[PDB]
Design a protein around this motif. Structure first.
Motif, PDB file in Angstrom:
ATOM      1  N   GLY B 183       0.781  -1.210   0.000  1.00 37.26           N
ATOM      2  CA  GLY B 183       0.000   0.000   0.000  1.00 37.26           C
ATOM      3  C   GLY B 183       0.820   1.270   0.000  1.00 37.26           C
ATOM      4  O   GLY B 183       0.323   2.312  -0.439  1.00 37.26           O
ATOM      5  N   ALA B 184       2.058   1.214   0.481  1.00 40.21           N
ATOM      6  CA  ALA B 184       3.015   2.299   0.326  1.00 40.21           C
ATOM      7  C   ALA B 184       3.974   2.079  -0.834  1.00 40.21           C
ATOM      8  O   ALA B 184       4.889   2.882  -1.027  1.00 40.21           O
ATOM      9  CB  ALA B 184       3.809   2.496   1.613  1.00 40.21           C
ATOM     10  N   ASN B 185       3.791   1.009  -1.600  1.00 41.38           N
ATOM     11  CA  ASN B 185       4.734   0.632  -2.637  1.00 41.38           C
ATOM     12  C   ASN B 185       4.649   1.615  -3.802  1.00 41.38           C
ATOM     13  O   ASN B 185       3.870   2.568  -3.786  1.00 41.38           O
ATOM     14  CB  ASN B 185       4.443  -0.791  -3.088  1.00 41.38           C
ATOM     15  CG  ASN B 185       5.567  -1.383  -3.865  1.00 41.38           C
ATOM     16  OD1 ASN B 185       6.723  -1.047  -3.640  1.00 41.38           O
ATOM     17  ND2 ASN B 185       5.245  -2.273  -4.790  1.00 41.38           N
ATOM     18  N   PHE B 186       5.465   1.396  -4.837  1.00 42.61           N
ATOM     19  CA  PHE B 186       5.321   2.253  -6.005  1.00 42.61           C
ATOM     20  C   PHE B 186       4.111   1.853  -6.821  1.00 42.61           C
ATOM     21  O   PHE B 186       3.478   2.710  -7.438  1.00 42.61           O
ATOM     22  CB  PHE B 186       6.556   2.216  -6.909  1.00 42.61           C
ATOM     23  CG  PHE B 186       6.686   0.976  -7.741  1.00 42.61           C
ATOM     24  CD1 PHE B 186       6.082   0.899  -8.980  1.00 42.61           C
ATOM     25  CD2 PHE B 186       7.457  -0.080  -7.321  1.00 42.61           C
ATOM     26  CE1 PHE B 186       6.203  -0.219  -9.758  1.00 42.61           C
ATOM     27  CE2 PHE B 186       7.592  -1.204  -8.102  1.00 42.61           C
ATOM     28  CZ  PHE B 186       6.960  -1.273  -9.323  1.00 42.61           C
ATOM     29  N   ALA B 187       3.783   0.561  -6.826  1.00 41.26           N
ATOM     30  CA  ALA B 187       2.726   0.057  -7.688  1.00 41.26           C
ATOM     31  C   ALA B 187       1.449   0.868  -7.545  1.00 41.26           C
ATOM     32  O   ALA B 187       0.794   1.182  -8.543  1.00 41.26           O
ATOM     33  CB  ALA B 187       2.467  -1.412  -7.377  1.00 41.26           C
ATOM     34  N   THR B 188       1.091   1.238  -6.320  1.00 40.41           N
ATOM     35  CA  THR B 188      -0.105   2.034  -6.083  1.00 40.41           C
ATOM     36  C   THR B 188       0.306   3.496  -6.059  1.00 40.41           C
ATOM     37  O   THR B 188       0.893   3.967  -5.080  1.00 40.41           O
ATOM     38  CB  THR B 188      -0.768   1.634  -4.773  1.00 40.41           C
ATOM     39  OG1 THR B 188      -1.093   0.240  -4.813  1.00 40.41           O
ATOM     40  CG2 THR B 188      -2.035   2.434  -4.577  1.00 40.41           C
ATOM     41  N   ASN B 189      -0.051   4.218  -7.118  1.00 44.74           N
ATOM     42  CA  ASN B 189       0.538   5.518  -7.402  1.00 44.74           C
ATOM     43  C   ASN B 189       0.055   6.015  -8.763  1.00 44.74           C
ATOM     44  O   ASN B 189      -0.713   5.332  -9.447  1.00 44.74           O
ATOM     45  CB  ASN B 189       2.061   5.412  -7.371  1.00 44.74           C
ATOM     46  CG  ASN B 189       2.731   6.741  -7.335  1.00 44.74           C
ATOM     47  OD1 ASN B 189       2.125   7.757  -7.659  1.00 44.74           O
ATOM     48  ND2 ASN B 189       4.000   6.753  -6.948  1.00 44.74           N
ATOM     49  N   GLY B 190       0.484   7.204  -9.160  1.00 49.10           N
ATOM     50  CA  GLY B 190       0.289   7.661 -10.521  1.00 49.10           C
ATOM     51  C   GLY B 190       1.441   7.284 -11.432  1.00 49.10           C
ATOM     52  O   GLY B 190       1.677   7.942 -12.448  1.00 49.10           O
ATOM     53  N   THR B 191       2.181   6.236 -11.067  1.00 43.55           N
ATOM     54  CA  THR B 191       3.316   5.758 -11.856  1.00 43.55           C
ATOM     55  C   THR B 191       2.916   4.656 -12.837  1.00 43.55           C
ATOM     56  O   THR B 191       3.174   4.767 -14.039  1.00 43.55           O
ATOM     57  CB  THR B 191       4.466   5.313 -10.939  1.00 43.55           C
ATOM     58  OG1 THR B 191       5.598   4.947 -11.736  1.00 43.55           O
ATOM     59  CG2 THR B 191       4.086   4.163 -10.057  1.00 43.55           C
TER      60      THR B 191
END
Ligand code: CLA
Ligand code: CLA
Ligand code: CLA
Ligand code: CLA
Ligand code: CLA
Ligand code: CLA
Ligand code: CLA
Ligand code: CLA
Ligand code: XAT
Ligand code: 8CT
Lengths: 73, 193, 92, 207, 195
Positions: B183-191
């Motif tokens: 949930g803090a990873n990069f996967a969940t993001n505008g990336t």
């Protein structure tokens, strides 16, 4: 005055260090400075595009006052 | 070579087996002429050494002197204090600050810019020495910086391209992950998408 | 005798510094490498009178031989940094 | 030698060398050797996923619909798209991709250089291998088969793989139409074979 | 060389038969590559010792003191320094604490890390052999150390798969099982059999 650049020894060092372009720019300052037509082909190509570039800006950015008021000019 | 970057690929021919940190990684075949390669050996060193020193300045002052690596250092000056460096205020002002930067660097770099030798540049020694100068010890330490530099460079991207995504500084963006890894990873993001 | 007349005096010294400090090395090193010519011959002997490469104005007893036109070439850059710093007042 | 249909071809470039070869390649994809090598592995990787995967569809729905005992959460194989719980589909997906792609690039770079994916120094520890080309063996055959039944065992892998691949495609197309589960599609046909057939519904029914 | 793990013979060809207690065990055939077996001979013995050191450790935690293992850090996660080892709590904090066990251990490994001989590194002798029980025969003792080791490691798993299951730490489980044998099992309350 001896301070400046030399047209040819600007060019002749631009052969890319691979060989994709081979000799690169070599003896071009010969052909250019000798051939007139080469110099004239560039002149018309350079000035030619600008003529158009003038027309692209000059209708949209009407520098002169009170044009885009009288249209047909 | 000290290993292969991709087990199952052969060593590229043009790279001579002895180079600092030779993994046989040259996917684009960038330098197929050792003539041209050497300049990029010299240059990979420099880009690292600046990159090395640049990383602590980004982390520390986020978690130590308390400022971001990006907006905090530069912004605070224009509309505010001349410098807070190390939580202290010097005299020096904006414009005349950068003026000093050209005298020095242009004096520092150009003095290096003129050398005949490639090796004595990358590896000056001299007054810079006070460490291993000899045989395998220097040869080994020679690998160690080239290797740390690669890592150090590859971090610098992560500093930029997290900050463009997250907006928080590198440690503030780090601490988030170690607290909750999911949930803090990069996967969940505008990336990703 | 204040900052406007001080800064340009304090700014120009930057460029003339680097020019003599080091870049006297590299400018002189390309000038020896770069000389103009046409048809494989320089412009004097091809018949052009006005084109004679002119060193007779360029000499000095300066320790390295730093000359008038290099003062002109660097001093002009000294006046670039001059009128960028005072004239802008843009974001500090 | 068995043929796909007994009277046709066995194309020139294809002899009966490899197992599971009945002489069917109408579109003639494999012709040059260094390609046919590739596709043979592309088959098995499919054939292996399809076998395992289909049992993921078949058995869980079978249990639930074969009785109260252990009803399958996620219901029909296409109703298990829902029921993620712990981790978000954003992260759990890119955890897969990173995790799989490590193993499967290892699989490719082996096909590229056959002898050793990894020789003993690189990729610290691990690297047991014991690898023949086209089949991993090694770790991946723990009980130590290839006891001399290989040729037969090879035929039995492909021929079951061929079918589970083909049978998997049914699960797709059936569910895409009848909107039911396989045993629902199964029994309803087995119940009344005629009215519950294909081609009475939606697809050939265009007529 | 003593007997073989299963009595199906076929002792695998590759092996240094004098090796400390090879029963001829390679179902997967990992060490076939001799240069690679050179590594896995040490990887074993160094793993076991830290099982051999930890297994009694995890044994006294739950028996004598308080906490089993996963109880230990989190009991002192709110506590920190408040341990009791025959004694009180010298003050240290998690960030400061790990520095010791990371850095003091790094060198201790790093001193062993580069050892031109593979035998010299795992069996140094000397300062690490204070007693001298090596005598003239270590070959009995070498195998002797392994059989204790392999079991120690294999014991360690018996801690982790129990406690990761619904089962708790072993010491009570040991007593729990010996209390009621029927109803204390991997199947019962362990839910290790998933039917
Ligand atoms: C009780 C469970 C357990 C088990 C089964 C193992 C098993 C193993 N450990 Mg080990 N270890 C354990 C607990 C365990 N460890 C604990 C609790 C610690 C920390 C105190 C360590 C710290 C440790 C170190 C520091 C090293 C090992 C190593 C090894 C391997 C040596 C075998 C070898 O040389 O063959 C050939 C080598 C193999 C690795 C065989 C491959 C077998 C499996 C499939 C590989 C799995 C590796 C793993 C997934 C790597 C990713 C995790 C990591 C990157 C975070 C072996 C796989 C050595 C190694 O290389 O592994 C790190 C090693 O030097 N162990
Ligand atoms: C790689 C080169 C590099 C560069 C360009 C910068 C640039 C900067 N650092 Mg910095 N820094 C670096 C490496 C670098 N750092 C390293 C390696 C360390 C650890 C030793 C630090 C530790 C550090 C601290 C502790 C602080 C900065 C700060 C700053 C900012 C104010 C500059 C200043 O007052 O310096 C002036 C330097 C001198 C007068 C020393 C002369 C030699 C500026 C953006 C400050 C900041 O965050 O904003 C104010 C601050 O407090 N840096
Ligand atoms: C030294 C390399 C390095 C490391 C340690 C980190 C570490 C971190 N990054 Mg990150 N990053 C890096 C480079 C790095 N980054 C670069 C170069 C990019 C640009 C491509 C990014 C782009 C990026 C984004 C967009 C985000 C992070 C985030 C994070 C944090 C969560 C981890 C994550 O999402 O993975 C990030 C994914 C990667 C770094 C993929 C690259 C992985 C390479 C192939 C290998 C990395 C491991 C490397 C060997 C070093 C690890 C050694 C190991 C022993 C620890 C964590 C602090 C996230 C975060 O903090 O969320 C709030 C987040 O949003 N990073
Ligand atoms: C996608 C899965 C897949 C793949 C990659 C292969 C691959 C192969 N099969 Mg094959 N096969 C499959 C599924 C697959 N099969 C299924 C499901 C069946 C049963 C219906 C069969 C039945 C079969 C027979 C009877 C024979 C083969 C043969 C072959 C080999 C040579 C023919 C060729 O060049 O194929 C290349 C094929 C592909 C790359 C697949 C591409 C898919 C295209 C692009 C779209 C097709 C969509 C489709 C109509 C739905 C080759 C290794 C022949 C052989 O000798 O091999 C042992 C042979 O005689 N197969
Ligand atoms: C990062 C993840 C990752 C990576 C790098 C690969 C890489 C590869 N896979 Mg792959 N795969 C993955 C995840 C991944 N896979 C997952 C999650 C699945 C689902 C289980 C599969 C299922 C799969 C199958 C079924 C097959 C491959 C195949 C391949 C190879 C050829 C791919 C191709 O044609 O690309 C084309 C380029 C693009 C699609 C872009 C290649 C080595 C094929 C192979 O090995 O053939 C011999 C093959 O048949 N993969
Ligand atoms: C060998 C695999 C296999 C098997 C055993 C079955 C078996 C069945 N399918 Mg089926 N199916 C398959 C492959 C298979 N199919 C594939 C690959 C597709 C996609 C092309 C379909 C598409 C499909 C639909 C759309 C429907 C069925 C239905 C059915 C059931 C009624 C029989 C029927 O109409 O089949 C027709 C079979 C075919 C058209 C393919 C020929 C199978 C070959 C000749 C066997 C060898 C029956 C249980 C129907 C059902 O249960 O309705 C309640 C139904 O609606 N299937
Ligand atoms: C990680 C610890 C470890 C390591 C590195 C080794 C290494 C070795 N053992 Mg060994 N062994 C171990 C633990 C270990 N053992 C344990 C715990 C037992 C007791 C069951 C034994 C019993 C044993 C016998 C009886 C024999 C060996 C032998 C050998 C040698 C050849 C076999 C080989 O390549 O193994 C390589 C080891 C690995 C690659 C480690 C893989 C570990 C994976 C990753 C974990 C799997 C866990 C498992 C699936 C779940 C737990 C179940 C439970 C049984 C633990 C080699 C030096 C043979 C030999 O020549 O004697 C010296 C021999 O005859 N061992
Ligand atoms: C060699 C492997 C090993 C390792 C890594 C640990 C690790 C640990 N032990 Mg431990 N222990 C071990 C073997 C080991 N034990 C053995 C063999 C025994 C039997 C004598 C014990 C008896 C023991 C007790 C009685 C306690 C620990 C405690 C602890 C924890 C605090 C560390 C500490 O301050 O130690 C203590 C050492 C010193 C203060 C000496 C400093 C010089 C830590 C998790 C404490 C704990 O977790 O609380 C429940 C604790 O109270 N250990
Ligand atoms: C691998 C595969 C299916 C894999 C399915 C999987 C993993 C299912 C996974 C799931 O269910 C689970 C596990 C659990 C669910 O909760 C989630 C999902 C995800 C739903 C199908 C291959 C399916 C492959 C098929 C159908 C291939 C058919 C090929 C035919 C008929 C012939 C092909 C040819 O190549 C030849 C032979 C000769 C050439 O000349 C002519 C042509 C035509 C090119
Ligand atoms: C004898 C002596 C004493 C001790 C030793 C020592 C070596 C120091 C030696 C030094 C003597 C000194 C002081 C020499 C100084 C020489 C100088 C300052 C020469 C001046 C050079 C500058 C020149 C031509 C001007 C160039 C062009 C300028 C500005 C134009 C700037 C421009 C402005 C801002 C408006 C339009 C745009 C443009 C063109 C950019």
């Amino acid at each position: 005055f001896g301070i400046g650049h030399s047209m040819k020894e600007i060019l002749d060092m631009h052969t890319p260090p691979s060989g994709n372009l081979g000799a690169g720019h070599q003896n071009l300052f010969d052909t250019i400075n000798n051939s007139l037509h080469f110099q004239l082909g560039l002149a018309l190509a350079s000035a030619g595009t600008i003529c158009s570039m003038v027309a692209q800006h000059m209708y949209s950015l009407p520098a002169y006052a009170f044009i885009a008021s009288d249209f047909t000019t | 070579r000290p290993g292969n970057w991709l087990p199952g690929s052969e060593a590229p021919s043009y790279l001579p087996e002895d180079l600092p940190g030779n993994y046989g990684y040259d996917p684009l075949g960038i330098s197929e002429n050792p003539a041209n390669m050497e300049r990029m050996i010299e240059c990979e060193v420099m880009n690292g050494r600046w990159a090395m020193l640049a990383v602590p300045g980004m982390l520390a002052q986020e978690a130590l002197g308390f400022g971001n690596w990006h907006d905090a250092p530069s912004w605070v000056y224009e509309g505010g204090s001349p410098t807070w460096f190390g939580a202290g205020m010097p005299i020096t002002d904006i414009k005349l600050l950068a003026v000093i930067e050209l005298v020095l660097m242009g004096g520092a770099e150009a003095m290096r810019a003129s050398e005949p030798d490639m090796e004595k540049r990358v590896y000056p020694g001299g007054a810079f020495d006070p460490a291993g100068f000899s045989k395998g010890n220097l040869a080994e330490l020679k690998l160690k910086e080239i290797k740390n530099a690669r890592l150090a460079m590859f971090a610098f991207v992560g500093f930029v391209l997290q900050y463009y995504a997250t907006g928080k500084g590198p440690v503030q963006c780090w601490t988030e992950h170690i607290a909750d890894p999911l949930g803090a990873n990069f996967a969940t993001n505008g990336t990703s998408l | 005798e204040l900052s406007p007349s001080l800064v340009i005096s304090l700014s120009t010294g930057l460029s003339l510094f680097l020019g003599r400090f080091v870049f006297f090395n590299f400018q002189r090193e390309n000038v020896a490498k770069q000389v103009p010519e046409q048809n494989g011959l320089t412009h004097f002997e091809a018949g052009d009178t006005r084109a004679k490469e002119y060193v007779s104005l360029l000499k000095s007893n300066d320790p390295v031989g730093f000359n008038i036109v290099d003062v002109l070439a660097w001093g002009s850059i000294g006046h670039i940094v001059a009128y960028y710093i005072l004239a802008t007042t843009s974001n500090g | 030698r068995p043929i796909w249909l007994p009277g046709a071809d066995v194309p020139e470039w294809l002899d009966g060398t490899i197992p599971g070869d009945f002489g069917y390649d109408p579109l003639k994809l494999g012709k040059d050797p260094e390609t046919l090598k590739w596709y043979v592995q592309a088959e098995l990787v499919h054939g292996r996923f399809a076998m395992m995967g289909l049992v993921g569809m078949l058995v869980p729905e079978l249990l639930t619909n074969a009785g109260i005992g252990l009803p399958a959460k996620g219901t029909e194989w296409f109703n298990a798209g829902a029921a993620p719980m712990f981790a978000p589909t954003g992260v759990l997906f890119a955890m897969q991709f990173l995790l799989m792609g490590w193993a499967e690039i290892r699989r490719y770079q082996d096909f590229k250089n056959p002898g050793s994916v990894n020789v003993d120094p690189i990729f610290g520890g691990k690297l047991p291998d014991g690898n023949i080309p086209g089949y991993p063996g090694g770790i991946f055959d723990p009980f130590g088969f290839a006891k001399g039944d290989v040729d037969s065992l090879k035929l039995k892998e492909v021929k079951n793989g061929r079918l589970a691949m083909f049978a998997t495609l049914g699960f797709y197309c059936q569910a895409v139409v009848t909107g039911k589960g396989p045993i629902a599609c199964w029994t309803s046909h087995l119940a009344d074979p005629w009215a519950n057939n294909v081609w009475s519904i939606e697809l050939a029914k265009v007529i």
